[PDB]
Write a protein that binds this ligand. Sequence first.
Ligand code: HEC
Ligand code: HEC
Ligand SMILES: O=C1O[C@H]([C@@H](O)CO)C(O)=C1O
Ligand SMILES: O=C1O[C@H]([C@@H](O)CO)C(O)=C1O
Lengths: 125, 125
Amino acid sequence: QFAKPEDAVKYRQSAFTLMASHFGRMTPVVKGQAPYDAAQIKANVEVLKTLSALPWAAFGPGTEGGDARPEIWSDAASFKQKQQAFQDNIVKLSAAADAGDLDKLRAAFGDVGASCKACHDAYRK
Amino acid sequence: QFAKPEDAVKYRQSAFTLMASHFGRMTPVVKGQAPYDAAQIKANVEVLKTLSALPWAAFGPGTEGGDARPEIWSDAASFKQKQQAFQDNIVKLSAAADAGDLDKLRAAFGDVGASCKACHDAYRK
Ligand code: HEC
Ligand code: HEC
Ligand SMILES: O=C1O[C@H]([C@@H](O)CO)C(O)=C1O
Ligand SMILES: O=C1O[C@H]([C@@H](O)CO)C(O)=C1O
């Protein structure tokens, strides 16, 4: 859906921006500094779930650019693993939110954050 | 969820970028230049539906900036109307996609585009 490589870059960057907002906005809730409304979190994690599936199709052949390291394409299996671990952690987070269970939410949120960071470290410039 | 006004601006801009991709990518399909896969479109409009609900909360009090005209806040009812018409057209588009009906899809897509443009003209700089 990306006329030029740059269009894929702008796409993925915007997806990550939104992912970051939907993830990061729950930190004061996971930390206890903002109140916990299970339905609010259930709805928010649904948004985050949708968003979290979006970037991957925007790392197609020939879409090198932005802060994407070239190893994303030369180590495609390793990047596929980091991405699939991440989305798998998203499934666990949806399950926790869907349960309305704050401890399971805190643990799932921590795992998701870790997978964000793991890819950050390997595959962002 | 926006520490500073600028954070709301970056949020909404990213939502619109993604909306634009998910809307605009269907043009060759609505035009007949790319093939029509009803399930592909059903899934895509589900994404667009999620995305299309996102910008509005990022035009909160005190988030003036970007290409947002100040009339968005001084004419809050008029902007609320343009936004609600738009999202209502999104519901019609979801119904068409969910039906797998290409003519209803083409008409719904046209109405959505028009609502995009109507707000563009009034409320973007
Ligand atoms: C888990 C929820 C997250 C969060 C919160 C973020 N990421 Fe990543 N990200 C990845 C790559 C390759 C990039 C560079 C993209 C490019 O420039 O082409 C990024 C970028 C970001 C950003 C910055 C976006 C921008 O405005 O430019 C942010 C805020 C961000 N990410 C947050 C790669 C990955 C992963 C690879 C498997 C995973 C997993 C994540 N990111 C997860 C997250
Ligand atoms: C219908 C599906 C659409 C599409 C495809 C787009 N819009 Fe709008 N949009 C609105 C406002 C006030 C802005 C300015 C935001 C800001 O800068 O603070 C925008 C911006 C855009 C963009 C540019 C995003 C960027 O990268 O900076 C794009 C690509 C875009 N829009 C497309 C306002 C509205 C509406 C008010 C009710 C409605 C409806 C729409 N936009 C709808 C759409
Ligand atoms: O929670 C997160 O951890 C990483 C980053 O902080 C690692 O440096 C990231 O992208 C997040 O949003
Ligand atoms: O389909 C669209 O119409 C408007 C714009 O072209 C009006 O100038 C817009 O934002 C779209 O994505």
